[PDB]
Amino acid sequence: MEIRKDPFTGEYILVSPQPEGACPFCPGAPETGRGWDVLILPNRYPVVTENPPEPTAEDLYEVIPARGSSLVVVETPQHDVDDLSDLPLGQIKKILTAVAEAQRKAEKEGNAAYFLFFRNKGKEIGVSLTHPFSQIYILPVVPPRVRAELQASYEWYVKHGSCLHCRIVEKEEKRLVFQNRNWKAFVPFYAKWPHEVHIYPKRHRSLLTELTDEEVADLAEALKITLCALKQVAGIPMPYIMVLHQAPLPRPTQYYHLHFEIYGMYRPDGKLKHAAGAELGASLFTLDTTPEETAARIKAALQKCLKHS
Amino acid sequence: MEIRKDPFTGEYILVSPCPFCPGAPETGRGWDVLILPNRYPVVTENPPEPTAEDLYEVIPARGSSLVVVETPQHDVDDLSDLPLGQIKKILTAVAEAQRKAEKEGNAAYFLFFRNKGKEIGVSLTHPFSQIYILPVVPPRVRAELQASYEWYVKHGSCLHCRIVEKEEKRLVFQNRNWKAFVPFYAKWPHEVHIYPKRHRSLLTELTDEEVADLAEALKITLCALKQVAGIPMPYIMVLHQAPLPRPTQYYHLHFEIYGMYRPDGKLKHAAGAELGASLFTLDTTPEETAARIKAALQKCL
Ligand SMILES: O=c1ccn([C@@H]2O[C@H](COP(=O)(O)OP(=O)(O)O)[C@@H](O)[C@H]2O)c(=O)[nH]1
Ligand SMILES: O=c1ccn([C@@H]2O[C@H](COP(=O)(O)OP(=O)(O)O)[C@@H](O)[C@H]2O)c(=O)[nH]1
Ligand SMILES: [Fe+3]
Ligand SMILES: [Fe+3]
Ligand SMILES: [Zn+2]
Ligand SMILES: [Zn+2]
Ligand SMILES: [Zn+2]
Ligand SMILES: [Zn+2]
């Protein structure tokens, strides 16, 4: 068990070699207990652990200890909820608060380079467990996609003197799908996935742990309303991926701005999109619909999720 | 229609808003291999003026999107099922298409790739592969070029040459001209890379004997991947080669094959870790996977 590094790309590989049908995440399961609104608990099959073994060493290759934590965020005690967006605003706020508290703990641990929060949703993208949950990896390395974003963000800031993310968030109007006092959700110009929405704080924040209580309440709303729109823009619930892009631990950055990326994986025609030869083999992406048309369609659908605006 | 560029990653988005049987309108009859224009091209010879926005880089979607119709036979399941002679005709046709793209001198890159399996979205059941002739280098290839060059400056040799010479434990197949191995840095559940033993940068540099031996290495390697998980496995194949049209001492062409079943025969999906973070997980070592693929490969010999 170790973290191997691709010497051509710098990518990391995490090499980590109850009755049937029972839910491991329901209240009363062996590791969950009872009387909780949100539970963060150790992953049964952890990609990273507090006490990783000596890594497998080969002469031409870099290997590092799989030192870290792999956590499951059990989002609600209720098993029969299709999506995060079906939970009340107050419950989503408790989920975000618990994830932030976990990150504050990680920000004390010298071994943690990165706090990666992500969510996979839908049987069609490999999620077999039906209980609402998300994942945290506390890692000894910065995830390669976030490293690339940090390096470009830094170079821009040094070259141009301002945060590029701040400039993008200020400009977004045509592709905006939702905004509140603290958050803007928009289809980026450079969208790659069939329904892609980025959620940014209007104030420059680079760590989840910088967010005020009000910002977290407004975040819960932006997540609920954006995911609600995705659930119906195609007529049936859409599988999606959500990832939090933030600074590395433990210190705020002037040049990087945190954001949630959401990849809705149905085309406008309800056809599932699979990352294949172009995407995985070349890092080339294709769209059969403009980001501008996709923003308009998401925004129209999203009107049916609004309570007062 | 245009190529958009992510300002944070450099990634390019091609924004572009049975047909392959003998007798159909675009195919005709009497052919073994056809290379024809894609009906929905992501790049074209006559792209329109790109959609511009002030903070972003946009490029005209200029190039070619081609379908390689591998056989006139509809009910062939995999490239590996075809006879060596037919696989040689496919590879020869693809190299002839690259020679034209080299001589015409507009394109930056010739990307040859194959998607196989209903489970990864290949609804068309007639065997085919694809070519994108592009005005940009694919970002994954650009990252490999940069790393290959920096190794070359620091060490004086081709890193790919050093890797190929060292591979034994994870070797699944070799012949006079090619080595197929599970890389130490594999990211997909069944991943095999096929390298020429001679340093070659471009598909167009391969001799006829190297093409014949490549047909053999692909047929046998894909035969093994078809059987290793106990049912035919969906896979992605991509050719990583230099940008057009000159070779280099520091970059070495290879095929990467991503077999997308875990050892249990269940589909691996690229999701939040892979697509969100460029982070990859393996529940089996590359070494154990190479042993299983090599064992399966012995039956294919
Ligand atoms: O009893 C279980 C069943 C599942 N999971 C976790 O739920 C996630 C499902 O996704 P996946 O196997 O792809 O995650 P990874 O293991 O790679 O982090 C996995 O991490 C599981 O190990 C768990 O902690 N306990
Ligand atoms: O009548 C058809 C049906 C399909 N295809 C091609 O088969 C490939 C299937 O993959 P995909 O649609 O995902 O490819 P892309 O278009 O993005 O290049 C596509 O290129 C199709 O356009 C075609 O040329 N004609
Ligand atoms: Fe990002
Ligand atoms: Fe490669
Ligand atoms: Zn449950
Ligand atoms: Zn900012
Ligand atoms: Zn056909
Ligand atoms: Zn070489």
- Residues of chain A with C-beta less than 8 angstroms from the C-beta of B120: 274, 276
- Number of Cα atoms under 13 Å in the Cβ half of residue A196: 21
Residue of chain A nearest B150, judged by CA positions: A8
B194 close to B210: Cβ distance less than 8 angstroms: no
Whether B140 sits inside 8 A of A9 (CB atoms) is yes
d(CA A125, CA B275): 12
Q: Partners of B114 in the beta sheet?
A: B237
- Residues of chain A with C-beta less than 8 angstroms from the C-beta of B162: 60
Technique of determination:
X-ray
Whether A191 sits inside 8 A of B115 (CB atoms) is no
SS3 call for B221: helix
* Signed CA dihedral, B49, B68, B101, B244: sign only: positive
d(CA A182, CA A159): 28
Q: List, in order, residues 6 or more apart from B295 with CB less than 8 Å away.
A: none
Q: Partners of B134 in the beta sheet?
A: B109
Gap from CA of A9 to ligand 8 centroid (Å)? 17
> Is the bond into B245 cis (omega within 30 degrees of 0)?
yes
For residue B24 and ligand 2, the question of a CB distance below 6 A is answered with: no
Measured in angstroms, the CA of A308 and the nearest CA of chain B are apart by 32
Which run of H or of E encompasses A146? helix A144-160
Q: Partners of B190 in the beta sheet?
A: B259
Measured in angstroms, the CA of A176 and the nearest CA of chain B are apart by 15
Measured in angstroms, the CA of B268 and the nearest CA of chain A are apart by 7
Q: Partners of B205 in the beta sheet?
A: none
Q: With CA atoms as reference, report the closest residue to A294 among A197, A207, A159.
A: A197
Gap from CA of A2 to ligand 1 centroid (Å)? 18
d(CA B6, CA B275): 14
Q: With CA atoms as reference, report the closest residue to A252 among A209, A201, A199, A214.
A: A209
CA-CA-CA-CA dihedral for A248, A250, A254, A256, to nearest 10 = 20
SS3 call for B267: strand
Which run of H or of E encompasses A241? strand A240-245
Whether B271 sits inside 8 A of A126 (CB atoms) is yes
What is residue B44's DSSP assignment? B
Q: List, in order, residues 6 or more apart from B198 with CB less than 8 Å away.
A: B177, B210
> Is the bond into A250 cis (omega within 30 degrees of 0)?
yes
Residue of chain B nearest A62, judged by CA positions: B185
Whether B113 sits inside 8 A of A277 (CB atoms) is yes
Residue of chain A nearest B286, judged by CA positions: A15
CA-CA-CA-CA dihedral for A223, A43, A121, A35, to nearest 10 = -60
Q: With CA atoms as reference, report the closest residue to B188 among B252, B243, B249, B120.
A: B120
Residue of chain B nearest A288, judged by CA positions: B17
Query: According to DSSP H, which parts of chain B are helical?
Result: 84-104, 139-155, 159-166, 208-228, 277, 286-299
B70 close to B131: Cβ distance less than 8 angstroms: no
Whose C-alpha lies nearest to ligand 2, atom 25? Answer: B39
- Residues of chain A with C-beta less than 8 angstroms from the C-beta of B273: 116, 118, 137
Q: Supply B280's token pair.
A: 């990859």
For residue A14 and ligand 1, the question of a CB distance below 6 A is answered with: no
d(CA A136, CA B187): 20
Whose C-alpha lies nearest to ligand 2, atom 23? Answer: B39
The b-or-e profile of B118-139 (16+ CB within 10 A means b, else e) is eebebeeebbbbbbbbbbbbbb
Interface A-B: count of C-beta contacts within 8 A: 222
For residue B217 and ligand 2, the question of a CB distance below 6 A is answered with: no
Amino acid at A298: I
CA–chain centroid gap for B133, Å, is 13
A208 close to A99: Cβ distance less than 8 angstroms: yes
Residue ranges of domains in chain A: 30-309
For residue A45 and ligand 1, the question of a CB distance below 6 A is answered with: yes
SS3 call for B130: strand
Ion ligand 7: residues, CB within 5 A, are B 18, 20-21, 74, 126
SS3 call for A132: coil
B64 close to B37: Cβ distance less than 8 angstroms: yes
Whether A285 sits inside 8 A of B166 (CB atoms) is no
d(CA B161, CA B77): 34
DSSP annotation string for A201-231 = ESS---SGGG--HHHHHHHHHHHHHHHHHHH
d(CA A275, CA B269): 8
d(CA B245, CA B225): 32
Q: In what order do the strands lie in the sheet with A284-287?
A: A284-287, B12-15, B2-5, B58-59
What is residue A127's DSSP assignment? -
N-terminal to C-terminal alpha carbon distance within chain B: 47
Best residue among B16, B39, B43, B122 to mutate for probing ligand 2, ranked by most atoms within 8 Å of CB: B39
Measured at the alpha carbon of residue A299, what is the angle toward residues A293 and A301, in degrees to the nearest 5? 105
For residue A277 and ligand 2, the question of a CB distance below 6 A is answered with: no
What is residue A8's DSSP assignment? T
Residue of B5, B79, B119, B269 to mutate when probing chain A, most A C-beta within 10 A: B269
